[PDB]
Design a protein around this motif. Structure first.
Motif, PDB file in Angstrom:
ATOM      1  N   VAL A   1       0.815  -1.250  -0.076  1.00 55.10           N
ATOM      2  CA  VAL A   1       0.160  -0.022  -0.163  1.00 55.10           C
ATOM      3  C   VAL A   1       0.953   1.361  -0.137  1.00 55.10           C
ATOM      4  O   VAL A   1       0.621   2.316  -0.822  1.00 55.10           O
ATOM      5  CB  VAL A   1      -0.968  -0.110   1.229  1.00 55.10           C
ATOM      6  N   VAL A   2       1.849   1.269   0.904  1.00 53.97           N
ATOM      7  CA  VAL A   2       2.765   2.369   1.193  1.00 53.97           C
ATOM      8  C   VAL A   2       4.115   2.080   1.025  1.00 53.97           C
ATOM      9  O   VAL A   2       4.599   1.216   1.851  1.00 53.97           O
ATOM     10  CB  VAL A   2       2.384   3.338   2.156  1.00 53.97           C
TER      11      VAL A   2
ATOM     12  N   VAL B   1      -0.388   1.775  -3.680  1.00 47.99           N
ATOM     13  CA  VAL B   1      -1.423   2.863  -3.862  1.00 47.99           C
ATOM     14  C   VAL B   1      -0.522   4.290  -3.515  1.00 47.99           C
ATOM     15  O   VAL B   1      -0.683   5.142  -4.340  1.00 47.99           O
ATOM     16  CB  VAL B   1      -2.390   2.869  -2.480  1.00 47.99           C
ATOM     17  N   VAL B   2       0.592   4.147  -2.682  1.00 42.56           N
ATOM     18  CA  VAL B   2       1.484   5.519  -2.689  1.00 42.56           C
ATOM     19  C   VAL B   2       2.811   4.769  -2.671  1.00 42.56           C
ATOM     20  O   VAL B   2       3.280   4.343  -1.687  1.00 42.56           O
ATOM     21  CB  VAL B   2       1.152   6.297  -1.213  1.00 42.56           C
ATOM     22  N   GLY B   3       3.716   5.363  -3.781  1.00 41.20           N
ATOM     23  CA  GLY B   3       4.844   5.224  -3.871  1.00 41.20           C
ATOM     24  C   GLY B   3       5.272   3.875  -4.432  1.00 41.20           C
ATOM     25  O   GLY B   3       4.382   3.221  -5.242  1.00 41.20           O
TER      26      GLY B   3
ATOM     27  N   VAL C   1      -1.860   4.625  -7.287  1.00 41.50           N
ATOM     28  CA  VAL C   1      -2.523   5.741  -7.267  1.00 41.50           C
ATOM     29  C   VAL C   1      -1.552   6.897  -7.250  1.00 41.50           C
ATOM     30  O   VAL C   1      -1.836   8.109  -8.127  1.00 41.50           O
ATOM     31  CB  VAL C   1      -3.452   5.747  -6.236  1.00 41.50           C
ATOM     32  N   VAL C   2      -0.787   6.964  -6.559  1.00 42.63           N
ATOM     33  CA  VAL C   2       0.077   8.311  -6.162  1.00 42.63           C
ATOM     34  C   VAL C   2       1.559   7.770  -6.305  1.00 42.63           C
ATOM     35  O   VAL C   2       2.041   6.956  -5.437  1.00 42.63           O
ATOM     36  CB  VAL C   2       0.069   8.988  -5.016  1.00 42.63           C
ATOM     37  N   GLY C   3       2.361   8.378  -7.308  1.00 41.40           N
ATOM     38  CA  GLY C   3       3.785   8.025  -7.519  1.00 41.40           C
ATOM     39  C   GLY C   3       4.012   6.662  -8.025  1.00 41.40           C
ATOM     40  O   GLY C   3       3.066   6.181  -8.879  1.00 41.40           O
ATOM     41  N   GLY C   4       4.935   6.126  -7.813  1.00 45.98           N
ATOM     42  CA  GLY C   4       5.447   4.873  -8.237  1.00 45.98           C
ATOM     43  C   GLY C   4       5.623   4.732  -9.751  1.00 45.98           C
ATOM     44  O   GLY C   4       6.077   5.786 -10.017  1.00 45.98           O
ATOM     45  N   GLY C   8      -0.896   1.522  -9.138  1.00 50.96           N
ATOM     46  CA  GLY C   8      -1.119   2.131  -7.901  1.00 50.96           C
ATOM     47  C   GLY C   8      -1.872   3.687  -8.065  1.00 50.96           C
ATOM     48  O   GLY C   8      -2.792   3.622  -8.789  1.00 50.96           O
TER      49      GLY C   8
ATOM     50  N   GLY D   4       3.731   8.800 -11.405  1.00 52.05           N
ATOM     51  CA  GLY D   4       4.068   7.614 -11.920  1.00 52.05           C
ATOM     52  C   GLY D   4       4.402   7.741 -13.267  1.00 52.05           C
ATOM     53  O   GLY D   4       5.158   8.667 -13.938  1.00 52.05           O
ATOM     54  N   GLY D   8      -2.010   4.626 -12.853  1.00 54.26           N
ATOM     55  CA  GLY D   8      -2.399   5.226 -11.496  1.00 54.26           C
ATOM     56  C   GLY D   8      -2.991   6.491 -11.681  1.00 54.26           C
ATOM     57  O   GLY D   8      -4.077   6.449 -12.496  1.00 54.26           O
TER      58      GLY D   8
END
Lengths: 8, 8, 8, 8
Positions: A1-2, B1-3, C1-4, C8, D4, D8
């Motif tokens: 997730v993070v 989800v994040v990073g 979702v955010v970054g990566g 995500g 990303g 995302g």
């Protein structure tokens, strides 16, 4: 997730 | 989800 | 979702 | 969704 690399 | 790189 | 890179 | 590279 993070953070991590794959999944989470 | 994040990073990370793939998914999350 | 955010970054990566993929997803995500 | 935000940032990303793909998706995302």
């Amino acid at each position: 997730v993070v953070g991590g690399v794959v999944g989470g």
